Structures are given as C-alpha cells and as structure tokens.
C-alpha cells in the first residue's frame, strides 16, 4: 500500500544493554505508529517495502548528558545525516537532525551511535518516519 509510517519513542531511564553497546544502535522500546510493520521493534531498524522517498526525524534527548555524542542515521550502514549533543561537562542535550531520502525495496535505516555514550539514559528520545510518496503531486 501507499501508507507507510512508523513512530517510536523512549519511555524509560534505563541503561543500555549488552547487545545495545556491542552494535552501539539506539533502542526505542515504545512504538506509537507501525502501518505496515515495516519497522522492526526489536531491532529498531526501518525496512522500505517498497521503492519511494522516505521521510526520517529524529530527536536523541540525553536529559542526564556527559560527554558529547555523536548519532547517526544509517542506510545500509552508511551514515546519512549525523548530529551532535553536549559539552564534557553536564548538561541536558538533544541531538536532532532530519533528512528525505530515496529508499529500495529491503532498504534498511536505522540510527547508531558513532559517538560517546548512553549512560543516564535516553528518555524522551524519539525517532519516526514515513512513506512521501513511492516511485504531479
């Protein structure tokens, strides 16, 4: 169908697990929107059913920040877009940054952290995206 999207938020402070730190890709346990479960929750990785442009926000909220971070949004695990968050010292940061990209079928997007940590959590974090179109309106 022509109605893709999906929406996916973290509800909680918690620390990031031993395969988060290992993969180092940024986990989003609560998902609000999911039309056409095309977006792997547990993975936390967007798979493109079909060809278009995609659409992709994201907002990294460290509320309890040190050390500055470094996230990503990946396609095929190349690095599109990137954003920065916080200073050494402690402070609240949000990294965020959008981007439409064009996608293939099985196309798969995700966000890593290239830079820093996770410690203190990443509540409130966010991270959705939709189908504009496939491939005049």
Not at 8 to 30: C, L
Not at 47 to 70: C, D, E, L, M, W
Not at 96 to 103: A, C, E, R
């Amino acid at each position: 169908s022509a109605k893709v999207a999906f929406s996916a938020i973290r509800s909680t402070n918690h620390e990031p697990s031993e395969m988060s730190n290992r993969t180092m890709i940024i986990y989003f346990d609560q998902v609000l929107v999911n039309i056409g479960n095309n977006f792997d929750s547990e993975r936390s990785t967007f798979i493109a059913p079909r060809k278009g442009i995609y659409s992709f926000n994201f907002h990294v909220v460290k509320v309890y920040n040190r050390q500055t971070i470094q996230v990503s949004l990946m396609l095929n695990g190349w690095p599109v877009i990137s954003a920065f968050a916080g200073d050494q010292d402690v402070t609240r940061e949000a990294a965020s940054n959008g981007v439409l990209i064009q996608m293939e079928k099985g196309d798969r997007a995700y966000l890593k952290l290239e830079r820093g940590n996770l410690m203190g959590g990443w509540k409130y974090s966010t991270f959705s995206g939709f189908l504009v179109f496939p491939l005049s309106a």
